C-alpha cells in the first residue's frame, strides 16, 4: 500500500467522522422551490493501529436518503460498493477525504424566509422579514445572517429586531441581520423603514433576492452515518475498542429567496 | 459537535 505505512501504533485508537454539507437553494416569491442541491464531503480523522480494513455505512437507498452520484478516495474498493452498498477500505493515517457527493432529492431546508414589502408612497418602504427554523428544536443553528438588499436611492434605514442585531451597510446596499444562535422550529422577524430619495422614475427597481448564510449541526441532505466498522486481524484489538466520533456541519451555499 | 457513535 502506497498511502499507508505498515507499522503504525496507537495506544488510544480513535476516529472522527465529519459530514460536511453545503446546502444550496433558490426559492420563488410564492414558496415554490426553483432549484436545490447539496454538495457534501465526508472527511475521516483516524488514529488506528496497524492496517485495518474499514467498512463504512450510511442510509444509502429510521430513514433512507438517496445519493445521486459520488466519488471516493482511491483507498476504497470501488467494486466492494459496486454490488453490496458496502463502502470498504483501509484508511490512510491522519486526516483524509473519504468521498465527495451531491444530493437533490428530499432536502431539508434549515430556514424559510418570508419577505413582506409595502410601498408607503414615493418616500418610504415598510418591510418585514420572518425567518423560520425548520429542524429539530434540540439543535442550534448558529452564524445566521439575513441579507436584505436595499434600493440605490436610499437615504437612511431604521430597523427593529427583537432577536439578533442589524446594520445597514450602505456601501453594499443591503441590510445585514445577524443572529448568533437560533433553535429549531422558531420564528424571528425584523422590521425596517427605508427612507427614499427621488429617483429617475422610469429607471425602476427589481427586488433582488434575500440571501442567507447559516451553519447547522446536521446534514441537510438527510444523510446519517450508521457504522464505521474497523477490523484488524493481526492485532489484539477489535471494534468495541475503537473510540468513534461523528459530527455534522451543514453550511449555507447559495441560499436566495426571491422577493 | 462531535457525538459518539452508538
Residue numbers in the entry:
A (entry chain A): 159 to 219, 238 to 435
B (entry chain P): 1 to 6
What does the paper say about this structure?
Clathrin-mediated endocytosis (CME) is a major regulator of RTKs involving the heterotetrameric AP2 complex composed of large α and β2, medium μ2, and small σ2 subunits. In this study, we discovered AP2 is also an IRS-1-associated protein. IRS-1 binds with AP2 to prevent IGF-IR recruitment into clathrin-coated structures and thus enhance surface retention of activated IGF-IR.
We also analyzed the crystal structures of μ2 C-terminal subdomain (C-μ2) bound to IRS-1 YxxΦ motifs. Collectively, these results indicate that IRS-1 is recognized by the AP2 complex via the μ2 subunit in the very similar manner to conventional endocytic cargos. The Tyr residues of the YxxΦ motifs of IRS-1 (Tyr608, 628, and 658) critical for the binding to AP2 are part of phosphorylation sites among multiple Tyr residues in the C-terminus of IRS-1 that mediate the interaction of IRS-1 with PI3K and subsequent activation of PI3K. In addition, AP2 would preferentially bind non-phosphorylated IRS-1 since AP2 cannot recognize phosphorylated YxxΦ sequence due to its limited capacity. Our results indicate that IRS-1 inhibits the recruitment of IGF-IR to CCPs through YxxΦ motifs in IRS-1.
